[PDB]
Design an enzyme around this catalytic site. Sequence first.
Site, PDB file in Angstrom:
ATOM      1  CG  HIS A  83      -0.398   0.122   1.960  1.00 35.06           C
ATOM      2  ND1 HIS A  83       0.213  -0.846   2.946  1.00 35.06           N
ATOM      3  CD2 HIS A  83      -0.178   1.079   3.546  1.00 35.06           C
ATOM      4  CE1 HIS A  83       0.660  -0.857   4.511  1.00 35.06           C
ATOM      5  NE2 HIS A  83       0.174   0.996   4.781  1.00 35.06           N
ATOM      6  CG  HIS A  85       0.440   4.299   4.716  1.00 29.55           C
ATOM      7  ND1 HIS A  85      -0.380   3.399   5.388  1.00 29.55           N
ATOM      8  CD2 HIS A  85       0.212   5.227   4.408  1.00 29.55           C
ATOM      9  CE1 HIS A  85      -1.623   4.290   6.379  1.00 29.55           C
ATOM     10  NE2 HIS A  85      -1.644   5.250   5.233  1.00 29.55           N
ATOM     11  CG  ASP A  87       4.645   0.524   6.626  1.00 28.46           C
ATOM     12  OD1 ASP A  87       3.756   1.692   5.303  1.00 28.46           O
ATOM     13  OD2 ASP A  87       4.536   0.004   7.766  1.00 28.46           O
ATOM     14  CG  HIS A 148      -3.765  -0.690   7.283  1.00 25.86           C
ATOM     15  ND1 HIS A 148      -3.251   0.187   8.268  1.00 25.86           N
ATOM     16  CD2 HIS A 148      -2.707   0.184   6.343  1.00 25.86           C
ATOM     17  CE1 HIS A 148      -2.462   0.147   8.082  1.00 25.86           C
ATOM     18  NE2 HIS A 148      -1.515   0.799   6.996  1.00 25.86           N
ATOM     19  CG  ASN A 179      -2.217   4.398  10.200  1.00 22.12           C
ATOM     20  OD1 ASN A 179      -3.291   5.215   9.847  1.00 22.12           O
ATOM     21  ND2 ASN A 179      -0.293   5.059   9.578  1.00 22.12           N
TER      22      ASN A 179
HETATM   23  C1  LIG Z   1       3.502   4.420  10.481  1.00 26.80           C
HETATM   24  C2  LIG Z   1       2.583   2.915  10.076  1.00 26.80           C
HETATM   25  C3  LIG Z   1       2.457   2.373   8.320  1.00 26.80           C
HETATM   26  S1  LIG Z   1       1.046   1.248   8.305  1.00 26.80           S
HETATM   27  C4  LIG Z   1       2.451   2.778  10.745  1.00 26.80           C
HETATM   28  O1  LIG Z   1       1.223   3.667  11.133  1.00 26.80           O
HETATM   29  N1  LIG Z   1       1.746   1.210  11.645  1.00 26.80           N
HETATM   30  C5  LIG Z   1       1.064   0.986  12.550  1.00 26.80           C
HETATM   31  C6  LIG Z   1      -0.229   0.124  12.467  1.00 26.80           C
HETATM   32  O2  LIG Z   1       0.329  -0.434  10.889  1.00 26.80           O
HETATM   33  O3  LIG Z   1      -1.209   0.554  12.570  1.00 26.80           O
HETATM   34  C7  LIG Z   1       1.263   0.188  13.991  1.00 26.80           C
HETATM   35  C8  LIG Z   1       2.192  -0.473  13.714  1.00 26.80           C
HETATM   36  C9  LIG Z   1       2.430  -0.958  14.926  1.00 26.80           C
HETATM   37  C10 LIG Z   1       2.627  -0.903  16.157  1.00 26.80           C
HETATM   38  O4  LIG Z   1       2.588  -1.649  17.670  1.00 26.80           O
HETATM   39  C11 LIG Z   1       1.183  -0.322  16.270  1.00 26.80           C
HETATM   40  C12 LIG Z   1       1.153   0.867  14.949  1.00 26.80           C
HETATM   41 ZN   LIG Z   2       0.011   1.625   6.849  1.00 30.03          ZN
HETATM   42 ZN   LIG Z   3       2.343  -0.628   8.331  1.00 27.62          ZN
END
Ligand SMILES: C[C@H](CS)C(=O)N[C@@H](C(=O)O)c1ccc(O)cc1
Ligand SMILES: [Zn+2]
Ligand SMILES: [Zn+2]
Length: 231
Positions: A83, A85, A87, A148, A179
């Site tokens: 996706h 984002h 990451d 997501h 997120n």
């Molecule tokens: C920066 C990334 C983009 S996807 C992000 O926001 N990741 C969160 C998610 O994926 O919901 C998240 C991951 C692990 C956790 O323990 C908590 C929150």
């Molecule tokens: Zn994401």
């Molecule tokens: Zn992520």
Amino acid sequence: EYPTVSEIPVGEVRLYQIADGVWSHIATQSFDGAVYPSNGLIVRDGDELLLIDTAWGAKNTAALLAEIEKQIGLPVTRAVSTHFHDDRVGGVDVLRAAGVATYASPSTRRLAEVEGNEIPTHSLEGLSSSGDAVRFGPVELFYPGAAHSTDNLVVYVPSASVLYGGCAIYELSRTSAGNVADADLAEWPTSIERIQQHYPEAQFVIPGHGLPGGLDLLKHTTNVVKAHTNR
Ligand SMILES: C[C@H](CS)C(=O)N[C@@H](C(=O)O)c1ccc(O)cc1
Ligand SMILES: [Zn+2]
Ligand SMILES: [Zn+2]
Ligand SMILES: [Zn+2]
């Protein structure tokens, strides 16, 4: 055992062999005052490698390519971002400069442009509608519907029975939603059900962040997502 968030210094990347010809890659990032782990996938493609997702930023993704050469020694020739984002696409320019052909759906490429994130070069066709699946080298790409994010893809490795959920699937340690800024909370359980119906044979399920498990991660994610909606 699978590396955890406290075991990876930010800037370093570890690989974990899941099955023959399938690794995950694991990185960490400081995000909004906390440290998170992040997974992608590496899949052997003959004498080449297919990468699923960046390692969350240019520095980490350069470290990823170095660790792949050190530990595997096959060239990464293609990459799919699941996706839009950071990451998933953060580091696409590092990949492009190293000669990796980067791919994403049209929706991911559009949303990345809107957001200001890096944009994978190639467009994947055939993934526009919920339940669409396409073969892409040694994986199957599947669009389960919005979850997501509206564009999120999952990846199945049929030779190894590995389901890569990306950030649409939560690790068991996460018992509250993370997120949700771009998420379709209402559709997410229905999209997870589509995955379960389409890949009932999966043995390994790899979340976008944290530890792998089994198909239990699908129900787990549904539980947590529904509990957030009902806050
Ligand atoms: C920066 C990334 C983009 S996807 C992000 O926001 N990741 C969160 C998610 O994926 O919901 C998240 C991951 C692990 C956790 O323990 C908590 C929150
Ligand atoms: Zn994401
Ligand atoms: Zn992520
Ligand atoms: Zn659970």
